[model samples]
Target: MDDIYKAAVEQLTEEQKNEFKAAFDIFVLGAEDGSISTKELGKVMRMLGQNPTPEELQEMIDEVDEDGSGTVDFDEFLVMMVRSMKDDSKGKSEEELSDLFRMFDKNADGYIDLDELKIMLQATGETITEDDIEELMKDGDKNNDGRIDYDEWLEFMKGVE
Candidate 1:
C-alpha cells in the first residue's frame, strides 16, 4: 500500500471504526425495512466524508438505474456505500465518486459553489476567509467554471490521497 493510504488508515480510531460499522448496520437495516431513500443515503455519505452535488446524484441515479427507471434502489445504495468505504488510492469508483459529489453539493446543484466550500472548511474548524476560499476555488476549478465540478473535485481529492 502507498504511504498516503497508510497515513489515512492510521488516522482512523478504533472508536470511529466501530461507529462506522454500527452506522452501516443501521443503514442496512433501514433499507431492509423499506425505509431507504436518496435523502437518507445522502446523510450516510456525508458521515463518510463525501460531498455530493445534484449532477453527481443524477450520475449515480443514471449509473445504478438497472431497469432504466432513473433511480437507485437499496442494493445500489449498499454497493455505493461499501465501495466508498473501501480504500482505493487510485481514486474512488464511479458510484463512490458520485456519492461524494452529491454529499458536498448541499444545495443539490450540479457543482459545489464557493460558499458551500467555505462552510465545509469552516466546519472543520478552519478559519477560511473569502479571499482564501476564492484562492482555493481558483486552484481547484480545473475547467475554469468559477466552480468545482465532480471531475475537478475528484482531482483535488486525488492530490490529497
Candidate 2:
C-alpha cells in the first residue's frame, strides 16, 4: 500500500513527507483502513469549513483514486497534496505556518516542546510512538534547544513545496 506513497514521497523533501504524513494520518486513523473514503473526504472538507457538493466530492475523489479502489489511500493523498502545494500558491505563507505552529504550541509558550509534539502527534493516533516523537523532535529542533521555535518551524515549512 505504501509503494505508491513511497514513490510519491521520493519527490518530496524529508520535511515535506513528514508534514504530509501528519495530515494523512488524521483521516485514516479512525478507520484504520489505510484509505479515505468519499464520505471521509467530504467530512474533512466540511470540517475545514468548505461545503463541497457531492459532485465536487466525487470529482476530487476520482482525481486521486489511482488504484480504482474508490477511496483515497495514503499514496493517493500524498499526490493530491503534492499537486496542490505545487500549484500557483507556491506553498503556504509564513502567516499560515505561524498559525499551524501556534496550534501545536499549546499553552502559548511560543515554542513546541517535546511534550507538546508528543501530545499533538499522539492525539492523532497511537501509531505515532515515543521513538517517532523523539526522531521528529530531533529534526524540528534545529538548534538543539529541546524545543521547536517559530523560526525553526518556519524554515522547515518553507523548504517544502
Candidate 3:
C-alpha cells in the first residue's frame, strides 16, 4: 500500500536503486504474513549495500530511533535503509559499518540471537514458532559454532538477493 519501491527508487541513487529494490522486494515478501525479522531486516540492509561491522550497524540503528525510544518506525527504517545503500556506494568506512552493526546487535554478543529476532518479528505482530526460530538459526549459522557471526550472517543474508 505504501509503494515503498517507487519511493525508494526516487530517493536512492542508481547503484543503490537495485539494492533498495531487492530489499523492498524482500520486505514485501516477509511482510506478507504481517511481520519481518531483525535478521531479515539486516539481510535487507546488506542487500542494500551495507557491509556493516557491528558498530556501524548500531549507529544506523540509533539514528533510526526516531522517538529516542530505542526503536525504529517505518519512516525511520526507510531513511536508514536508503541511506545505508547510498553511503556504501559512496564508500563508507569500516568504522562506519562497525557502528551500524553494533547498534543492531544490541546485546553486544557479536551476533543477533533468536530472542532479538523474536522481538523484531513481534513488533510487526507476526507469529513465529520455536521450530521456525531453530530452522532460521540453523540456516543462518554457517560456522557451525552455535551462533551466527557477522560475516556468516551477512553471507546468509545474500540469499535474499
What tens digits encode model 1's per-residue C-alpha lDDT throughout 5-43?
Answer: 345445657565556555445655656444345356454
lDDT of each: 0.56, 0.61, 0.55
Candidate scoring better on TM-score of 1 and 2: 2
> Looking at candidate 3, what is the lDDT of residue 18?
56
Query: Which digits, one per residue and each the tens of the lDDT, describe model 2 over residues 58-101?
Result: 55444455455555566656656544443344335767778877
What's each prediction's TM-score?
Answer: 0.38, 0.41, 0.36
Superposed on all Cα atoms, model 2 deviates from the true structure by an RMSD in Å of: 15.8
Would you list the rank order by TM-score, best first? 2, 1, 3
TM-score quality measure for candidate 1: 0.38
Question: Which numbered prediction scores highest in TM-score against the true structure?
Answer: 2
Q: Residue 37: error of model 3 in Å?
A: 33
Q: Which has the better lDDT: candidate 1, or candidate 3?
A: 1
Clash number for each model: 11, 0, 22
What are the root-mean-square deviations of the candidates from the true structure over C-alphas?
15.3, 15.8, 14.2
Output the number of the lDDT-best candidate: 2
Residue 113's lDDT within candidate 3 is 62
Q: Candidate 3, after superposition: displacement of residue 30 in Å?
A: 35
Model 2: lDDT of residue 100 = 79
What root-mean-square deviation over C-alphas does model 3 reach? 14.2
Q: List residue ranges in candidate 2 displaced over 4 A.
A: 1-59, 62-92, 156-161
